[PDB]
Curated annotation (Swiss-Prot), chain A:
Protein name per the record: Protein phosphatase 2C 50
Known role: Protein phosphatase involved in abscisic acid (ABA) signaling. Together with PYL3 and SAPK10, may form an ABA signaling module involved in stress response.
GO biological process, one term: regulation of intracellular signal transduction
Disulphide bonds in the chain: none
Cofactor dependency: Mg(2+); Mn(2+)
Gene Ontology molecular function: any one: protein serine/threonine phosphatase activity
Cofactor note (record): Binds 2 magnesium or manganese ions per subunit.
UniProt lineage: Eukaryota, Viridiplantae, Streptophyta, Embryophyta, Tracheophyta
UniProt domain PPM-type phosphatase: residue ranges: 3-305
Enzyme class: hydrolase
Chain residues that bind Mn(2+) 2: D61, D246, D296
Residues at which Mn(2+) 1 binds: D61, G62
Catalytic activity field: O-phospho-L-seryl-[protein] + H2O = L-seryl-[protein] + phosphate; O-phospho-L-threonyl-[protein] + H2O = L-threonyl-[protein] + phosphate
Subunit structure: Interacts with PYL3, PYL5, PYL9 and PYL10. Binding to PYL3, PYL5, PYL9 and PYL10 is dependent on the presence of abscisic acid (ABA). Interacts with SAPK10.
Record gene name: PP2C50
From Swiss-Prot, chain B:
Other facts: Plants overexpressing PYL3 exhibit abscisic acid (ABA) hypersensitive phenotype during seed germination. Plants overexpressing PYL3 exhibit tolerance to cold and drought stresses.
An example Gene Ontology molecular-function term: protein phosphatase inhibitor activity
Lineage of producing organism: Eukaryota, Viridiplantae, Streptophyta, Embryophyta, Tracheophyta
GO biological process, one term: response to cold
Function: Involved in abscisic acid (ABA) signaling during seed germination and abiotic stress response. Acts as a positive regulator of ABA-mediated inhibition of seed germination, and tolerance to drought and cold stresses. Together with PP2C50 and SAPK10, may form an ABA signaling module involved in stress response. Inhibits the protein phosphatases PP2C06 and PP2C09 when activated by abscisic acid (ABA).
UniProt keyword annotation of Nucleus present: yes
UniProt name for this protein: Abscisic acid receptor PYL3
GO cellular component: cytoplasm; cytosol; nucleus
Motif Gate loop per UniProt: ranges: 65-69
Motif Latch loop per UniProt: ranges: 95-97
Family: Belongs to the PYR/PYL/RCAR abscisic acid intracellular receptor family.
Organism: Oryza sativa subsp. japonica
């Protein structure tokens, strides 16, 4: 059902440490996260029973290695699907609910659980149990994920990867980069006794150019795996979603990315698994980032929302 | 005794230390392998060194991603196998630690009734433009503390 394309390259970097995920029908979204039980019961529908399929897209920008980005690619959608099913069952035991708080909680708990699995704080299952940390303590990854269903897009962001929505051929930021010099992030780090130091960019303790990530247990409690969540109902003028690592956003603005992606999709349709038009849009954004001098791995997912 | 420094006013200097539940010969056998710092340095991804390990040896280090820099060129300035002293200076790279020089000493100790090691590492470096001495020492200390933590873990895993 989902119409998407994904282009990724190590680029001019030696090894590839970006990872990506695109999982159609990965879970059912509990409708009690989108509308109240009272309103649906007014129409005779049981909000706890209704089924709405959802797909998950994710970009995971690893640093220190590829192992945490790959672990995120393999595990986040599984943990999120299980957490969503458990949450639907437990919402059947509750009255009216603050929906944004529960979206925040389910994504926060999912990201924290993946982080705990990476750092070896909890056991993980593959028919076999795993317990020791997946890799070294200075390996980490960003995680920008978008749950897509017919009526809503839900974005959870942790790190400096970014997702942008093209609406009315204009850019709408669905995630705010977790940069250490962000006023609230610096305030939090400094309140914990940490330092934000401008050392080739503002960095946590002068080392890491992001204030949140999955992994990086040597930088706790300053670098946390807590995502920022946005719930956005889909609209008439939605064109597409752009998820990408900073390999794109370092050299391409939100506006240029949205324009290029939307016009590439339309041009493919005029001129003529993954969808070819969205794949051409993602390939064009990748190659554009390369042409404008991006040093990094580049990973771009374009999701056609029409 | 070994970690004295006279940093000027364009420089800063500090030190870190770490106790390791391992005998001195093992910890020194790890840190003396100048051609292979990745044996305990958790940020090193590659290291290349030609020739014999002697004063004047030069190694080319690439570090892992996510860091403020990517590479470093490092010269062995002192090697004392009797008093267990190692001294290295950063002579090149794409980082902001100009004229960085470090001294690492290993000393015998008793820890939990067993042979142990006290490792001390001090440094002097130019303060790069746009930063303070406090920030530079804080940054280098964070990195050196990671290095000494990993050296402790590697040494103690070897003794076990
Ligand atoms: C991890 C690290 C980050 C940098 O920006 C500089 C440099 C590339 C030198 C590097 O090795 C520095 C290492 C340091 C300070 C000490 C050491 O390892 O003895
Ligand atoms: Mg990366
Ligand atoms: Mg990147």
């Amino acid at each position: 059902a989902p119409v998407w394309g994904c282009a990724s390259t190590r680029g001019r970097s030696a090894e590839m440490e970006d990872a990506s995920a695109a999982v159609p029908r990965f879970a059912d979204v509990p409708v009690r996260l989108l509308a109240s039980r009272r309103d649906l019961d007014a129409l005779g529908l049981d909000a706890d029973a209704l089924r709405l399929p959802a797909h998950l897209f994710g970009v995971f920008d690893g640093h220190g290695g590829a192992e945490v980005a790959n672990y995120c690619r393999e595990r986040i959608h599984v943990v999120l699907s299980a957490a969503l099913a458990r949450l639907g069952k437990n919402l059947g035991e509750m009255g009216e609910v603050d929906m944004k708080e529960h979206w925040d909680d389910v994504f926060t708990k999912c990201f924290q659980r993946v982080d705990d699995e990476v750092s070896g704080r909890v056991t993980r299952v593959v028919g076999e149990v795993r317990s020791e940390p997946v890799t070294a303590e200075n390996v980490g990854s960003t995680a920008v994920v978008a749950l897509v269903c017919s009526s809503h897009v839900v974005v959870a962001n942790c790190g400096d990867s970014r997702i942008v929505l093209c609406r009315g051929k204009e850019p709408v930021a669905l995630s705010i980069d977790h940069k250490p010099d962000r006023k609230d992030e610096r305030a939090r780090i400094e309140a914990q006794g940490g330092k934000v130091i401008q050392w080739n960019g503002y960095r946590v303790l002068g080392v890491l150019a992001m204030s949140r990530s999955i992994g990086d247990r040597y930088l706790k409690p300053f670098v946390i795996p807590k995502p920022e969540v946005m719930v956005v109902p889909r609209a008439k003028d939605d064109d597409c979603l752009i998820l990408a690592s900073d390999g794109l956003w370092d050299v391409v603005s939100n506006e240029e990315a949205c324009k290029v992606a939307r016009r590439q999709i339309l041009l493919w349709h005029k001129n003529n698994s993954t969808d070819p038009a969205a794949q051409a849009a993602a390939d064009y954004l990748m190659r554009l980032a390369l042409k404008k001098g991006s040093e990094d791995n580049i990973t771009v997912i374009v999701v056609d929302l029409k | 005794r070994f970690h004295r420094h006279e940093p000027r006013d364009h420089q800063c200097s500090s030190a870190v230390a770490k106790h390791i539940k391992a005998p001195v010969h093992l910890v020194w056998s790890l840190v003396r392998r100048f051609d292979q710092p990745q044996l305990f340095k958790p940020f090193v991804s590659r290291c290349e060194m030609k020739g014999n390990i002697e004063i004047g040896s030069v190694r080319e280090v690439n570090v892992k991603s996510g860091l403020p820099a990517t590479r470093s060129t490092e010269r062995l300035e002192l090697l004392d196998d009797n008093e267990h002293i190692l001294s290295v200076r950063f002579v090149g790279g794409d980082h902001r630690l100009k004229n960085y020089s470090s001294i690492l000493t290993v000393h015998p100790e008793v820890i939990d009734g067993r042979p142990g090691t006290l490792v001390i590492e001090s440094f002097v470096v130019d303060v790069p433009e746009g930063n303070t001495k406090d920030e530079t020492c804080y940054f280098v200390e964070a990195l050196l503390k990671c290095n000494l933590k990993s050296l402790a873990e590697v040494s103690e895993r070897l003794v076990v």
